[PDB]
């Protein structure tokens, strides 16, 4: 019973495959794959050998499939939009540009509904949605002539945008919502015309919807953006997946729940309430999962398989409404990005090492003794790491306590105690004798009055400014400065430093001398580039201290 | 420093750690108290000692004479302890009893 | 310390004031080697009558239920320091109660040592182990061939402290635990205590075999009492002393006042003839000067037909009439006892002359019509 | 091992290939593939498929050497390769490359027919690209091209080889030099020429803009990281003479490095704490792949051929976690243990998250400290020079700071982490005004400090 | 506002019944013995005293004294005052078959 099988392998750049771009889709028994390269592959899933590969030019960015017409639409990056019959009369086959249809060459994303081919094309700064026919009878696979356009005025620019169809019940690759929700989000217009709706999440973050029936325009009738495109919610961060879920499960499933998903892991869920006033209300939830999210999908019954960079995790909304917090167990598979979920639950993924794999989720004698042995070895293995992490925690804890002391000292010094007595520093002038000449020395005493211990990370900086006036000619020393490490200090203790102030040249001292102490606290030492300084004090020597009689 | 007059909180010097060239050499290439004593006759030391002062007979004046050149002898003259503790010029501690 | 300048540092080290005016604290708060996230906000002034206090979902599930106390403390507490002292205490309590969900043993010592020790005992012994591995239960045999079980409950630190030993037998079991001791040690003490009480067991085994014991039905091994039936609709209950089983028991009589009296008289006359060298039965038979029935009725024992609240027949003319609607209970009651009981319970609701509630014994819907 | 009778092994997509030149009787030795997979019931390797390939001549001196998975450039499919050497004892050596397909069929790509036997770091790389040397001359033969090439540059060893992004194929042979293998010949933030003397094996990990983060390991049996030329987190290894490193992933957040040694032993170090979680002795082979089917890698260790005359027996498979396999009632205790494993694992995952939370709070409170005391750049930029035995540091100001109105000073502050002891440290400050082409017109005020060096080069270093 | 749940609410039902029984005044004690025999009679012939004697010490919070003062009372002091005096009476009556560690914790209270 191997829960994960490996099917085939692909060329992976160092540092892993790219997020966003690579995609996996599955037909009845085929699986179609793109890896963010010039290639698109087809795997017969019985024995996972590749039937056929398709070399396009330039980086397939998104795929879709039509089962009834048996076609495969793809988006080349800077070129347009290709089409391939799956019969398609080395196993590699390069595509001739005969297959190109609407080469718009600026189109960033596209999706499909029944008879329509909604696309979305980067112009200049403002991106613009378009909408095409697509001929229902099996003919030359054509777009047809453009029914409509719009301008997504809100968007002014790596991350491709995303599109989702949200048709209602009664009226297709997308998701069919239920009527109460449909009515909550898109209103009476959409309800009554029984119009599909298109949700575009853009790399900007905000996620805008546009009603299709409302989107018919012409050169005599241009589509008005401020009327026609509207904006559900402003996620701060780029958008990765939009879906819908059957919570309360108690193919055409009348979904009930709306899911959006940020890159950085703001999930957002919406559901219909009709609560508390006899009125329909919306249920917003901005959950916050961890991680950069890489891909997402939807599985039977409110489960949402997503893939952080660490592992393939999973979240359940299925059961007040949905969920107070989202709490989300891994399933012990690697960073799979590009996840797809067929229901029977048996999901298909591409491992960021670049592998294709089909994850299929769900006594005796003395051999029992071997089992015991294995489990005991296991627990011994893991315990030693749990050990390691506790010690780590102890260090970061130590840090916080230290930092705390710092913040308490800091706050005490800037406060006005009405008596400056967390830390004090007197200076005092004297006279000594060196070789022949009397020298003038400043003692700088540091005294701790308050309880707070200055442990490692603090350092005294004293600065001796010989005079305060700047001349035509810059002197050879406007000021000297000294700095000493203060270590542990402790409470009530005292440290002393003596400084020369006194004539090393000419026997000439001009007085006022200003001796200024300050303290610097360094974040790094306990573990923009920063610190803080704090103003202890400033003593002036005014000649009267330099007399000796 | 401990027996000193002021009894003021001075940091202990703890002279420099082995050599800043030693440090260089470690990085670039990576116990009982010792005692000595003498005895001497009280008769010799008496005719040899004081004549001078009060002089509690031997133990205190002997140490005063031993430290007559040290700057902190007058304190021991006052306090009369016949025994003392202090720090070195190089940083080690030294306790001298008589 | 007294003032909230060093005392707050010392008593909640991992609460860091963000703002210069110390108004917003953020960080962690400690309890039983576990740090919980916590973020606090005061007003412009130092009044807690209004303040914000947010927590991680870790901390709220654990302060589940006490929400109203904490909410109250926010309004009642004078200083922040005392509010934190109280909330750490409170948190300790909420953790110590639901100690089931919150723990982690030290595997390197624990799981291996316990399995080594169960191997030292012998795997013939062990009969049960809990998924949390906290409770285990072992078995032993008498020389007579009787099984006696022992439950231990183990802490996070097994070898360090004593494990709580629970055993059936009626004298208090005493187990000299050392830090050096292990399961073999306490098990040897248990076998010693078993062999001590052998005689009491022999007594009760002989009684339950050769006599219709009545109301310790399927009696435990703790049980000292044996309501023996004799003749018809009269019984003698008999309590035995474990240290001195063969010695004279406490015995007296329930049943018909006219039948029992001559029996009490005959007992009085023969009590000097008691002898603790024979058996209890072999002494009682010649003391009360009668024989017993060996299970005169096995099917229709005295099914207790008493109130199951007041334990009396004939409460004030009334009979046990109101019964349980249950095959497994079938317990009669009285109107009065069962009315005063149901009017008490919180679950019960009263229609006009009817009260619906739970049967005291089995907690099933029972109806009482006054 | 490399002989006719003797095998070589390989791991391809959660299974194990056994290539053997079986000298077969009518016939010359045949290349045989067994393809073997791990049952999980029976705790053995069972044969799931076979394949054979006849080499065309009754000529001796066939030899397996060099075999891994590569990625063919036509498709984008990894496949097993195998390099035969063919010697007719003519002083001519053929050197086939075979690539074996999903169908259990082989596909030659290169014949390549050299004259002298090769004896050096033979190393296959992505676009099936053989690459070897004799006397400090590197040669490579792509399968795309078909033609032999010499490397224009001149290198001693070829420490790393593989597709760095946007540079096609590449070599690191001298740690400055970083070739292309299209246009033969940035060396700025690769590991130092200081370490270049001891580095024996490298293995790049990730790339940004360039800037690569990279592990290495050395002759002193060390193991070191680098993030843009920043030797973080050195480790040390018990055993000697290291050959190679692989990487292993194993699960949620755990990374190991499996390090192999010449002495037929190997170790695993747990990233996040460059330590040793396990060491082994013995070992015909080591392989790293997901063997189990659990969706995390494991490591498979083969123990010496002393045991039996049969291969893939005497194995051991070990995540170094929950998964561990190898070659009187008791049942009631087990599910307590199984639950004990799962509580332990969950407790692990919660500690890690908890730890992250602690770091986030420490950062938050640094920034809070900084903002509590307190935009326009008051200072351009910093520079320092050493004159003889003095250090001078100076800083060039901007318009906003007017030395007419503000006396300014500067100070230097040593990291106390180095300075276990405390001297003072002194600095003299000059202001320097120079007028710029007075012959509006820019003055230049800069502000400078001077100090002794030799007091600060106690620890070979300082910050 | 003034609804109070019974403080024995959360215990194994048998203990709940015992403590419910003892509530009923001075003939409260006698009743207890009938309860213990009427649980010897049912499927769980032994009665797990060790758990009741743990649960009797477990603490919860109360607010007594001035208006605001948080205090921690074990169960034994929190359940109704005639239940206390008839509990301890029924433990006096059945002391021999009790584990001493628990008993002592109770006396400690
Ligand atoms: Zn009654
Ligand atoms: Zn009932």
UniProtKB/Swiss-Prot annotation, chain B:
**Protein name, please?**
Fanconi anemia core complex-associated protein 100
Oligomeric state and interaction partners are given as: Belongs to the multisubunit FA complex composed of FANCA, FANCB, FANCC, FANCE, FANCF, FANCG, FANCL/PHF9, FANCM, FAAP24 and FAAP100. Forms a subcomplex with FANCB and FANCL.
Reading the lineage from the top rank, the first entry is Eukaryota
Give its localization.
Answer: Nucleus
Residues found modified as Phosphoserine: 12
From the broadest rank down, the organism's phylogenetic lineage runs:
Eukaryota, Metazoa, Chordata, Craniata, Vertebrata
Q: What does this protein do?
A: Plays a role in Fanconi anemia-associated DNA damage response network. Regulates FANCD2 monoubiquitination and the stability of the FA core complex. Induces chromosomal instability as well as hypersensitivity to DNA cross-linking agents, when repressed.
Fragment boundaries within the full protein? 656 to 768 of 881
Q: Which organism is it from?
A: Homo sapiens
From Swiss-Prot, chain C:
Catalysed reaction(s) here are: S-ubiquitinyl-[E2 ubiquitin-conjugating enzyme]-L-cysteine + [acceptor protein]-L-lysine = [E2 ubiquitin-conjugating enzyme]-L-cysteine + N(6)-ubiquitinyl-[acceptor protein]-L-lysine
Entry function: Ubiquitin ligase protein that mediates monoubiquitination of FANCD2 in the presence of UBE2T, a key step in the DNA damage pathway. Also mediates monoubiquitination of FANCI. May stimulate the ubiquitin release from UBE2W. May be required for proper primordial germ cell proliferation in the embryonic stage, whereas it is probably not needed for spermatogonial proliferation after birth.
Question: One Pfam annotation, family name?
Answer: FANCL_C
Which consequence is recorded for altering residue 311 to A? Loss of interaction with UBE2T
The record comments on the domains as follows: The UBC-RWD region (URD) region mediates interaction with FANCI and FANCD2.
**UniProt: Zn(2+) 1 binding residues:** 307, 310, 334, 337
Keywords, A to Z, come to:
Acetylation, Cytoplasm, DNA damage, DNA repair, Fanconi anemia, Metal-binding, Nucleus, Transferase, Ubl conjugation, Ubl conjugation pathway, Zinc, Zinc-finger
> Quick one: effect of changing residue 252 to A?
Impairs interaction with FANCI and FANCD2
Q: How is it modified after translation?
A: The RING-type zinc finger domain is monoubiquitinated in the presence of UBE2T and UBE2W.
Changing residue 248 to A: reported impact? Impairs interaction with FANCI and FANCD2
Q: In which pathway does it act?
A: Protein modification; protein ubiquitination
List the molecular function annotations (GO) for this entry.
ubiquitin protein ligase activity; ubiquitin protein ligase binding; ubiquitin-protein transferase activity; zinc ion binding
Protein name, as recorded? E3 ubiquitin-protein ligase FANCL
UniProtKB/Swiss-Prot annotation, chain D:
User: Could you tell me the keywords of this UniProt record?
Assistant: Acetylation, DNA damage, DNA repair, Fanconi anemia, Nucleus
Q: Which disease is it linked to?
A: Fanconi anemia complementation group B: A disorder affecting all bone marrow elements and resulting in anemia, leukopenia and thrombopenia. It is associated with cardiac, renal and limb malformations, dermal pigmentary changes, and a predisposition to the development of malignancies. At the cellular level it is associated with hypersensitivity to DNA-damaging agents, chromosomal instability (increased chromosome breakage) and defective DNA repair. Some severe FANCB cases manifest features of VACTERL syndrome with hydrocephalus.
Name of the protein this chain belongs to: Fanconi anemia group B protein
Main function = DNA repair protein required for FANCD2 ubiquitination.
Describe its partners and assembly state. Belongs to the multisubunit FA complex composed of FANCA, FANCB, FANCC, FANCE, FANCF, FANCG, FANCL/PHF9 and FANCM. The complex is not found in FA patients.
Subcellular location(s) of the protein: Nucleus
Q: Which organism is it from?
A: Homo sapiens
* A single BP term in Gene Ontology: interstrand cross-link repair
Report disulfide bridges, numbered on this chain: none
Q: What are the record's GO terms for cellular component?
A: chromatin; cytosol; Fanconi anaemia nuclear complex; nucleoplasm
UniProtKB/Swiss-Prot annotation, chain E:
Compartments reported by the entry: Nucleus
Q: Does the keyword Cell membrane apply?
A: no
Q: Does the keyword Phosphoprotein apply?
A: yes
Q: Look up the domain of life of the source.
A: Eukaryota
Q: Which GO terms describe its biological process?
A: gene expression; homeostasis of number of cells; interstrand cross-link repair; ovarian follicle development
Position of the signal peptide: none
PTM details?
Phosphorylated.
Q: Which UniProt keywords apply?
A: Disease variant, DNA damage, DNA repair, Fanconi anemia, Nucleus, Phosphoprotein, Ubl conjugation
Where would you say this protein principally sits, based on its record?
nucleus
* Gene Ontology CC terms, in alphabetical order: centrosome; chromatin; chromosome; cytosol; Fanconi anaemia nuclear complex; nucleoplasm; nucleus
Q: How does it assemble?
A: Belongs to the multisubunit FA complex composed of FANCA, FANCB, FANCC, FANCE, FANCF, FANCG, FANCL/PHF9 and FANCM. The complex is not found in FA patients. Interacts with FANCC and FANCD2.
Q: What is the protein's known function?
A: As part of the Fanconi anemia (FA) complex functions in DNA cross-links repair. Required for the nuclear accumulation of FANCC and provides a critical bridge between the FA complex and FANCD2.
Record's disease association = Fanconi anemia complementation group E: A disorder affecting all bone marrow elements and resulting in anemia, leukopenia and thrombopenia. It is associated with cardiac, renal and limb malformations, dermal pigmentary changes, and a predisposition to the development of malignancies. At the cellular level it is associated with hypersensitivity to DNA-damaging agents, chromosomal instability (increased chromosome breakage) and defective DNA repair.
**Protein name according to UniProt:** Fanconi anemia group E protein
Q: Which gene encodes it?
A: FANCE
Included stretch of the parent chain: 12 to 120 of 536
